[PDB]
């Protein structure tokens, strides 16, 4: 019920600015405040600044200069506004209800990838075992995600119904491209016999990959 | 069921101790900050300090560092704080009241403190009829003058309890180191001489119960 | 230090009105202000923490506003009940102020005291002392003036006036009017009388009695 | 501003542990601290606030402590849900500063990895791509090698590597391993081999693959 959304752009050209608005539902602004924390790619929890119930605002120290806030309380929004990126501010963004001096409720928080590389849909393979595999008990299968950009990338197994035994593994970066792998084992019983896809969407290029993990017949 | 219980007063002498307690009741006494309140007779409140049951955490309001020490106890749910070298400005009601670190939802009753190097003396009552120079109309108000009492505090009750038929208690005064305070009942005509008013005073602190039946003249 | 002041010591409001009592404090304490109630003769109660976050069991007519240095705990609909004292405190930082407390006053018709004037007890004063009594009760409002003349002597030594609370019951007050004297000097005079002087009367309510007519 | 310090950065323990974090201020903040919890790449959780206040269907076994500008967050009797990182932050005044983080690791017994050798798939050969996968899945500790012989020659280039949190249910890590030639590279080899040297075994789990048989 109580719910922060936060929307932003995925990615930036160094130099430029962003705009980044959290979409706040199930109470109003009016009687709580709402902070903006950022977390840059394995590092803490950095604040960024806030907006009071009654509009005032406070900024990071060191950030005051390129940032601004505010909010539309009809609206239910409130924006954050950061001139002249770098690569540094590559980080994922939050929203976050300060109810009473907590951060109760936090957004789900959106990825912002300050680079002048561009988006490239992943190129999606499937990882069928051998014939060697059916003598086991359960059976290991997967997922290549190969080469795609910005990051991030979500793969389901059998529309989300295959969640046991999964692995995801998190995206590495080789050159401006990124790659990931996903294994689910599933019992032999299953496979082949029935269908196993692997579902991989890619926001930022409206691309949506289903791929049926066939067995290599060779 | 959250009760914080005090004792009612406590009487002690200039350059004395005390060590004041609360019982708590209904709650986990270990996950709820206690606080502590003073109050000086009919003026503001004063925070002193708070203690955190469970880990011993305290803050303290620097005025009261020398004097008032927080202290608990886990294994009877009491909250203690002691007060050291009372000076006669020490006299007030002193509450206990349990929270979260910056607000308290619950407050005990108080317990009032006496310090004085007064001695603990019994109340002279005197009755208040109307005197000689008459004129009864329907209504007639009748009194009690409960006087050289010590420490606080007296009950007056006006007859059999029945009595409450306006009945008006006045605060006690210190005068000379000791206590003077006075309560009337008015009453229809009707009723007083033809029938029996006697106001009931009693001082707790000497185990006193005087009664005195009002006559005319 | 944050000193939080309530700059009205009283308050009048008819039953049925709505009343607001402002607490200030000396720079931005954001929300962090509490609000207690007292009713007479017993402890402070909450009915407001975090500015405006009413509190378990606290009726609706009391709301509480503000952010920054202004708080408002408003009363809706003030019931006689009410009545009593109210303070604000903040939490920002330790230690913790307190406001001055604002004592709520119910509005009543004006009423001028019905004084008695009462000898010293026969009993008193087989001990040596003479204490001439004087209650000027129920009346409104509670500025009411009192002095004893001996004999046409303004005597005001020996003098204790106690106050009563506004009643509950009739929103009145009554007082008690003590003129102290030793033996000696009750016996040394005839004429006493107390006189009381309130805005219902611009005759000063005068209670007299002679020692001697008995 | 008040800066928070965090310490220690990371720890290791095991189910049934109490587990001691600390943050330091530069300067009072009155209480005025909270805890969180963050799993990865999720939203960060409300722990404590107030300084020992927990959130609601927070278990009891968290224990927060302080004042001034020393405060504690104790973990008695560790779960396996546990792992994470823990932060802390000061809601006294602004700027607002969290602790640099603390990674809770659960420790367990020793296992070995499952390891899957997966063959380029036809659709990536087209593309002129050769991406041979080895997946070394459920290990306890978390540190793995993994070589890669191409006709018994070592390679070291071209591999990516990469690495699971630890797992909610049995605490386990899990990696993959991913080697990629171009086709032309590959069909001009016949055996592909993923070999882990874990410190579960004084001999590495090899798993090969033959590149023209199913």
């Known amino acids: 019920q109580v719910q922060l959304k936060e929307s932003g752009p995925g990615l930036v050209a160094p130099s430029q600015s962003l705009s980044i608005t959290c979409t706040v539902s199930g109470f109003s602004l009016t009687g709580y405040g709402v902070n903006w924390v950022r977390q840059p790619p394995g590092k803490g929890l950095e604040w960024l600044g806030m907006?009071?119930?009654?509009?005032?605002?406070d900024y990071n120290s060191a950030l005051k200069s390129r940032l601004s806030i505010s909010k539309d309380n009809s609206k239910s929004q409130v924006f954050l506004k950061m001139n002249s990126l770098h690569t540094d501010d590559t980080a994922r963004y939050y929203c976050?209800?300060?109810?009473?001096?907590?951060?109760?409720?936090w957004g789900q928080g959106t990825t912002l990838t300050v680079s002048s590389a561009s988006t490239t849909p992943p190129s999606v393979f499937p990882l069928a075992p051998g014939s060697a595999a059916q003598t086991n008990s359960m059976v290991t299968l997967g997922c290549l995600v190969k080469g795609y950009f910005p990051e991030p990338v979500t793969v389901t197994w059998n529309s989300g119904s295959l969640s046991s035994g999964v692995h995801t593994f998190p995206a590495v970066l080789q050159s401006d491209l990124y790659t990931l792998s996903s294994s689910v084992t599933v019992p032999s019983s299953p496979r082949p016999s029935e269908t196993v896809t692997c579902n991989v969407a890619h926001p930022a290029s409206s691309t949506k990959v289903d791929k049926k993990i066939v067995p290599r017949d060779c | 069921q959250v009760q914080l219980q005090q004792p009612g007063s406590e009487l002690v002498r200039p350059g004395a101790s005390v060590k004041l307690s609360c019982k708590a009741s209904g709650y986990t006494f270990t996950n709820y900050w206690m606080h502590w309140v003073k109050q000086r007779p009919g003026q503001g409140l004063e925070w002193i300090g708070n203690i955190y049951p469970g880990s011993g955490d305290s803050n303290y309001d620097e005025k009261f560092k020398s004097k008032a020490t927080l202290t608990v106890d886990t294994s009877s749910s009491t909250a203690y704080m002691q007060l050291s070298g009372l000076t006669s400005e020490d006299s007030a009601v002193y509450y206990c009241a349990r929270g979260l670190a910056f607000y308290f939802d619950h407050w005990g009753q108080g317990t009032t403190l006496t310090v004085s190097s007064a001695l603990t003396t019994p109340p002279s009552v005197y009755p208040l009829a109307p005197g000689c120079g008459d004129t009864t109309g329907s209504s007639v108000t009748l009194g009690c003058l409960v006087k050289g009492y010590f420490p606080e505090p007296v009950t007056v009750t006006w007859n059999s309890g029945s009595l409450s038929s306006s009945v008006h208690t006045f605060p006690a005064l210190l005068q000379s180191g000791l206590y003077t305070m006075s309560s009337s009942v008015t009453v229809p005509s009707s009723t007083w001489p033809s029938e029996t008013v006697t106001c009931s005073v009693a001082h707790p602190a000497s185990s006193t119960t005087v009664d005195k039946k009002l006559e005319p003249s | 230090?944050?000193?939080?002041?309530?700059?009205?010591?009283?308050?009048?409001?008819?039953?049925?009105?709505?009343?607001?009592?402002?607490?200030?404090?000396?720079?931005?304490?954001?929300?962090?202000?509490?609000?207690?109630?007292?009713?007479?003769?017993?402890?402070?109660?909450?009915?407001?923490?975090?500015?405006?976050?009413?509190?378990?069991?606290?009726?609706?007519?009391?709301?509480?506003?503000?952010?920054?240095?202004?708080?408002?705990?408003?009363?809706?609909?003030?019931?006689?009940?009410?009545?009593?004292?109210?303070?604000?405190?903040?939490?920002?930082?330790?230690?913790?102020?307190?406001?001055?407390?604002?004592?709520?006053?119910?509005?009543?018709?004006?009423?001028?005291?019905?004084?008695?004037?009462?000898?010293?007890?026969?009993?008193?004063?087989?001990?040596?002392?003479?204490?001439?009594?004087?209650?000027?009760?129920?009346?409104?409002?509670?500025?009411?003036?009192?002095?004893?003349?001996?004999?046409?002597?303004?005597?005001?030594?020996?003098?204790?006036?106690?106050?009563?609370?506004?009643?509950?019951?009739?929103?009145?007050?009554?007082?008690?009017?003590?003129?102290?004297?030793?033996?000696?000097?009750?016996?040394?005079?005839?004429?006493?009388?107390?006189?009381?002087?309130?805005?219902?009367?611009?005759?000063?309510?005068?209670?007299?009695?002679?020692?001697?007519?008995? | 501003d008040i800066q928070m310090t965090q310490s220690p950065a990371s720890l290791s323990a095991s189910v049934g542990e109490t587990v001691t974090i600390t943050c330091r201020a530069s300067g009072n903040i009155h209480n005025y601290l909270a805890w969180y919890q963050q799993k990865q790449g999720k939203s960060p959780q409300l722990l404590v606030y107030?300084?020992?206040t927990l959130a609601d269907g927070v278990p009891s076994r968290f224990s927060g402590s302080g004042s001034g500008t020393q405060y504690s967050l104790k973990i008695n009797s560790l779960q396996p849900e546990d792992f994470g990182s823990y932060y802390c932050?000061?809601?006294?005044?602004?700027?607002?500063?969290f602790g640099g983080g603390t990674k809770l690791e659960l420790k367990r017994a020793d296992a070995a990895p499952t390891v899957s050798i997966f063959p380029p798939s036809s659709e990536q050969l087209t593309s002129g791509g050769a991406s041979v996968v080895c997946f070394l899945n459920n290990f306890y500790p978390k540190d793995i090698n993994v070589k890669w012989k191409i006709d018994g020659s070592e390679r070291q280039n071209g591999v990516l590597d990469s690495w699971t949190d630890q797992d909610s249910k049995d605490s386990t890590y899990s990696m993959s391993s991913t080697l990629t030639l171009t086709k032309d590279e590959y069909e001009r080899h016949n055996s592909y081999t993923c070999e882990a040297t874990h410190k579960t075994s004084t001999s590495p789990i090899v798993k090969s693959f033959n590149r023209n048989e199913c």
């Open positions: 107030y300084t020992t």
């Open positions: 976050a209800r300060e109810r009473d001096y907590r951060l109760d409720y």
């Open positions: 907006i009071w119930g009654d509009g005032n605002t």
């Open positions: 932050q000061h809601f006294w005044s602004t700027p607002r500063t």
